[PDB]
Amino acid sequence: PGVLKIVKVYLAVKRRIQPGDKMAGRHGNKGVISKINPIEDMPYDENGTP
Amino acid sequence: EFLKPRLVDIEQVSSTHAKVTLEPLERGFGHTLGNALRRILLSSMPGCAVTEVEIDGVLHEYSTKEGVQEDILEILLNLKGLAVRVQGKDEVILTLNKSGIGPVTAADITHDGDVEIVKPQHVICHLTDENASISMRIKVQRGRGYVPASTRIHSEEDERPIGRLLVDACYSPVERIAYNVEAARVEQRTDLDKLVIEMETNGTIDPEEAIRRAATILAEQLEAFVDLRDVEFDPILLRPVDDLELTVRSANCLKAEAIHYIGDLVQRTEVELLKTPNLGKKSLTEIKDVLASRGLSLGMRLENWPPA
Amino acid sequence: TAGTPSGNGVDYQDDELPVYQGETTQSLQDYLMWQVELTPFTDTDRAIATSIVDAVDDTGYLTIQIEDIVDSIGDDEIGLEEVEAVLKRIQRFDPVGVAAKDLRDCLLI
DSSP: OOOOOOOOOOOOOOOOOOTTSEEEOTTSOEEEOOOOOOTTTSOOOTTSOO | OOOOOOEEEEEOOSSSEEEEEEEEEOTTHHHHHHHHHHHHHHHOOOEEEEEEEEESSOOSSSOOOTTBSSOHHHHHHHHHTOOEEESSOSOOEEEEEEESSEEEEGGGBOOOTTEEESOTTOEEEEEOSTTOEEEEEEEEEEESSOBOTTTOOGGGSSOOOTTOEEOOBOOOOEEEEEEEEEEOSOSSSSOOEEEEEEEEEOSSSOHHHHHHHHHHHHHHHHHHHHTOOOOOOSTTSSOBSTTSOOOHHHHHHHHHTTOOBHHHHTTOOHHHHTTSTTOOHHHHHHHHHHHHHTTOOSOOOOSOOOOO | OOOOOOOOOOOOOOSOSSTTOOOOOOOHHHHHHHHHHTSOOOHHHHHHHHHHHHTBOTTSOBOSOHHHHHHHHOOTTOOHHHHHHHHHHHHTSSSTTOSOSSHHHHHHO
């Protein structure tokens, strides 16, 4: 009875992955990110794939 | 007293795979030139990437287009993988219109003056009914590294209309680099090394040109070590004091007390400014009345007072 | 009901013996007295500032007269000459034009 009009608004955002974020495998191995490393610093094999 | 590597035997396996050989090398230099080259080539190579898109009906990314099989987000992710090679420009616009059935690819992008599509079979969209059309404008820019769309704000200096479809830009044409050091076939010398570099790219940058660019970057960076050597602001202040329109008696009093700027005055407390000769209780409130209209109460504290 | 509005945000004090307790709020005079505390004023100047801030309406206008402000102080050397100076200093606060005598004063300030 009081209500005269209702307007609903929906917002959408994208969450960029960041170190303070928490990650896990499905064996009970959880952890948070400590650093996002440039591609030339990661270990790589003989074919050059890091 | 050191041999200098030469660019010989550059062979190209595929449109993206290639091999580069540096035949003469000393004992340890193989890796010093190699690892340095791999780091430079993986980190800082120029390229061209799609920066923003403008589809007709779509105004954002979380919508759908009737007759198109994929969402706008999937179309943008497809466009992120489009590889182009522009010449003489940094802001080409790639108009694309296609109505009918079947996957839409870069091939049917309108033939620009100097723009090369390295692979024209790269699909970006699908059409599902005869009476459907897709029309879009794609902006391509030249850059060096990974520039996220969210991290850039100078593009918002001018307001962008509702309907933009910006995509993260990578700008890096190199995907994988491996190097390996072998023994040179030169038998007259006791033992020499040969460096072989395999680079896998998107077809946009030439292998020899990439090696030249990396070597030039390294030389410019080394130029610094070749000869290391080496061994009271706010505009209301700092204003002429004859801008407060004070009474006559204040003019001589301020001159007598060496008050010539606005900032120095506001640093004077009531009890110590009253000690000045013939200041006047009512005249003091006149000084405060004028400085209050400016918002400047007496008793402020500045740190450094310049002569200007 | 064809459509129902979402429930309005509500709260209640949990893990506290005097349940629901309360919450402080900021008003116009509370925000003006905060600025008075952080500006260089003397004791008498602070007293005058509190006196004229208490008289500010919700609109932020000065409901009481300046002469009535001088009367309220009832202190020597607190004539309207310095009450006016403190009044202008207060008028030049964050809601510019607040504590103004009338409509002309708001626009002039």
